[PDB]
């Protein structure tokens, strides 16, 4: 036979009754007491099933609900066991999903019925859980301390095919982030379309949602191509009213217009921002309904000003990359030069950095790059 | 009364429907995808089945709705034709509790639902009431308020830590006082904390205590024991204090002059800033964040509630006018079609403050638009 382990947290060992009914029917039972232990146990066991002994007992109700959605999220299914207390706050605490509960006696055959419904999910969890982004894709442009948070954040919000708001300062790598969560999105093998729109006129911009290729003159709406995959919208607030309409229409109906008949698609939508969004909102300028459609999740891309310990490593890569790309003899920075570039403010962040270095490298006549050839 | 919704444009996929209809359940069905959103945001606690059957809706918009703000108030559930389990099994990241096989064990589906239906029957403990079972809306009463009411009613009693978010000057503490009423510790003391204007050393002297207090000293937790403590402008906390906070948040213990002791305090926190920006930059311990972000509540600014502006100003008028004998008794329609049009960055606070100012200047009984923002 083949099955899946399952743990249970309780100080009262003698509270077996429901335990041997599962071991004999084939369940890998594990039991924790001291409250702090199961966290490590749950984070190491991976996807499983946990039973919560509520029978008055001795646990902090805050810490409980905390654990419930700490990192033990979808990968863990909630379930409680109580001594018949459905009345006060305690049963209102079953707002934490919990799927079902346990009568104080032993609903012998009913117990499997309660459990059996959920079992299809754990064997489903195992099919999707191994992934883990194995290759440790060290933020394909940066790697420091605020960055590791970003990875973890990106890794857990990636697969969730919801719309996410990406915000940070200009030239930080919001697009770089967008491309990264597309790999995580589980629609990774599908196309990805970043769009530095800006330099588009309404007519031409409007030509994206319903087209103005009069007669099939080699023209296809952008939304269409991004079907199954991911589309990115850059500098979004610059959008005109009429197009924001079509977006919300599309965001609600998922349909687009083509000359060869109106059609529907399946595109996960992302958005980037660097401006004071709230200031636009209050005046009336931005449709708030649309904001709630997109602000389902937020991710903040930290500027170079935030990280600073990244500045050195970034320059090295940008050195290596551009020097190798153009055969340049420049291969290293002096300790002098290193101990100066970080002090710069870098308003344009990642963008400006590569751009600046790009120039210096193509101007660099030496192998070691001094401060004289840089910020001048 | 009866929840039980299911989303699909077609219909002939009854088979699992009459098993509910014939057993006596009012099933409700949505098609145009956009409609259930408004429906889900207004219905409150219920159960929704998402029929996707590999021929229905775009999984982005779906997962969006599923996790827009329709979170705990709704339990997820899907329907597929077996011949489908493949590309997006990951959409079951939203709990979803269970799914629907193509074979239909007529009794098993009821077994899956009936056990889960009992959880919705727990929501019945507050009995939806609709008609504002609280203090007329504590401070407001419009459309985002009724959700807020519904929201407060179901997340209130749960003595877990909750993160309160809205814009500045909205009335976040008023909510805490309001949800404390729903809590099972209502008869206990309540202590608000404006964490904005406090120094580290003195802050540390509030928890486990510091300084050199060989005189007279008593911690908030002690006073707040059994009751509820609220933290306003929480992100303003220094590193060293967030440490001590988490210490308590894990152990529930404090230090006092008369020896160290432990307590049982439900903890709340208020915020008006960009929460996502603080965590990533490093300013707030994320571990600590999950201890408090167990539940979220969104306090709607005046920008959302345009129909509240009229009702809000009137209430604040009567109360303060009476307090200072003011002759002012009403607003002109002129003033009305100006107060609503205003942006109100400071929201409820600013509204209360401005009117408060005007009243002390109002020499007339009728208040015209000229006497307002002055
Ligand atoms: N016209 C362009 N052509 C080719 N590559 C470009 C162009 N513009 C930017 N890039 C590349 O984008 C990469 C980084 O992504 P990006 O600049 O979009 O991040 P971002 O600045 O945070 O996003 P945003 O577009 O919102 O400003 C840079 O390495 C740059 O080479
Ligand atoms: N000791 C106190 N106990 C109970 N209530 C108090 C006490 N002191 C003040 N209050 C009231 O609590 C409210 C707190 O105002 P506050 O500025 O914190 O609201 P807020 O909108 O949540 O703040 P913020 O703009 O930082 O978000 C005040 O209106 C005040 O009347």
């Amino acid at each position: 036979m083949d099955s899946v382990p399952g743990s249970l947290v309780v100080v009262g060992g003698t509270y077996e009754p429901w335990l041997p009914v599962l071991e004999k029917v084939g369940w890998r039972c594990t039991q924790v007491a001291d409250l702090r232990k199961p966290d490590a146990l749950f984070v190491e066991t991976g996807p499983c099933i946990g039973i919560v002994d509520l029978s008055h007992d001795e646990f902090s109700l805050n810490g409980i609900a905390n654990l419930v959605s700490s990192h033990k999220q979808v990968r863990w299914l909630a379930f409680i066991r109580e001594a018949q207390l459905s009345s006060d706050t305690i049963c209102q605490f079953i707002v934490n999903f919990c799927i079902d509960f346990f009568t104080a006696p032993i609903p012998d055959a009913q117990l499997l019925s309660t459990i059996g419904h959920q079992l299809g999910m754990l064997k489903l969890e195992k099919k999707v859980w191994p992934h883990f982004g194995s290759a440790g894709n060290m933020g394909l442009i940066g790697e420091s301390m605020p960055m590791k948070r970003l990875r973890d954040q990106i890794k857990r919000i990636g697969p969730t095919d919801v719309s996410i708001l990406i915000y940070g300062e200009s030239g930080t790598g919001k697009e770089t982030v967008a491309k990264a969560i597309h790999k995580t999105s589980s629609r990774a093998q599908k196309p990805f379309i970043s769009v530095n729109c800006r330099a588009m006129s309404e007519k031409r911009l409007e030509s994206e949602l319903f087209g103005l290729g009069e007669t099939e003159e080699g023209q296809q709406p952008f939304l269409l191509q991004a079907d199954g995959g991911t589309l990115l919208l850059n500098d979004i607030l610059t959008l005109p009213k009429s197009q924001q309409l079509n977006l919300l229409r599309f965001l609600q109906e998922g349909t687009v217009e083509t000359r060869q008949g109106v059609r529907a698609v399946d595109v996960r939508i992302l958005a980037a921002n660097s401006s004071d969004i709230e200031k636009a909102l209050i005046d009336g300028d931005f449709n708030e309904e649309l904001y709630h459609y997109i602000n389902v999740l937020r991710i903040n891309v930290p500027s170079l000003k935030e990280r600073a310990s990244d500045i050195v490593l970034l320059a090295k890569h940008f050195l290596q990359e551009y020097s190798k790309e153009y055969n340049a003899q420049a291969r290293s920075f002096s300790d002098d030069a290193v101990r100066g570039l970080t002090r710069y403010h870098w308003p344009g962040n990642v963008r400006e950095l590569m751009n600046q270095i790009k120039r210096v490298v193509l101007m660099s006549d030496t192998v070691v790059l001094d401060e004289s050839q840089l910020d001048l």
Side-chain angles (χ1 to χ4, degrees), chain A residues 320-332:
Chain A
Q320 162 208 323
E321 184 60 46
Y322 282 144
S323 177
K324 187 161 50 187
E325 177 177 15
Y326 307 113
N327 133 93
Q329 60 283 8
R331 301 203 101 145
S332 62

Side-chain angles (χ1 to χ4, degrees), chain A residues 345-363:
Chain A
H345 287 359
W346 311 104
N349 310 122
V350 170
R351 179 233 229 215
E352 169 186 1
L353 181 65
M354 78 147 195
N355 282 263
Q356 181 69 202
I357 295 191
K358 169 198 192 181
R359 298 210 169 254
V360 177
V361 166
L362 298 191
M363 293 283 302

Side-chain angles (χ1 to χ4, degrees), chain A residues 19-165:
Chain A
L19 278 179
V21 191
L22 315 177
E23 304 204 46
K24 188 52 65 182
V25 85
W27 285 97
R28 296 189 180 96
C29 155
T30 316
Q31 188 181 260
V32 259
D34 233 20
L35 100 55
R36 54 187 294 187
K37 301 176 181 176
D39 198 332
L41 172 67
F42 269 100
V43 83
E44 72 94 1
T45 188
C48 62
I49 181 64
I51 300 177
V52 180
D53 181 27
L54 284 185
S55 71
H56 207 354
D57 294 314
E58 185 251 337
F59 305 107
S60 62
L61 264 167
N62 181 25
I64 295 177
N66 153 256
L67 188 45
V68 169
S69 291
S70 173
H71 277 189
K72 332 296 187 302
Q73 250 286 150
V74 57
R75 53 107 148 183
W76 162 83
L77 304 165
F79 217 92
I80 68 261
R81 158 76 180 177
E82 69 277 23
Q84 209 1 277
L85 318 171
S86 43
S87 57
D88 209 349
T89 162
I90 316 172
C91 43
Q92 190 58 227
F93 166 75
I94 317 299
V95 71
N96 300 257
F97 287 90
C98 289
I99 99 98
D100 206 345
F101 44 68
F102 267 0
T103 75
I106 325 190
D108 278 26
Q110 161 75 200
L111 209 97
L112 308 327
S113 187
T114 58
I115 296 180
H117 305 338
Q118 196 65 212
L119 188 54
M121 234 64 39
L122 218 170
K123 214 185 178 182
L124 192 148
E125 282 176 9
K126 288 293 187 178
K127 283 199 283 186
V128 296
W129 221 79
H131 303 350
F132 213 72
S134 66
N137 306 37
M138 311 284 191
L140 265 301
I141 238 124
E143 214 292 324
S144 59
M145 207 66 177
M147 199 67 48
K148 188 167 186 177
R149 291 181 272 258
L150 203 75
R151 294 203 307 256
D152 276 327
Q153 228 160 0
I154 287 180
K155 285 178 180 183
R156 57 189 182 208
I157 71 191
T160 82
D161 294 326
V162 306
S163 300
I164 306 188
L165 173 60

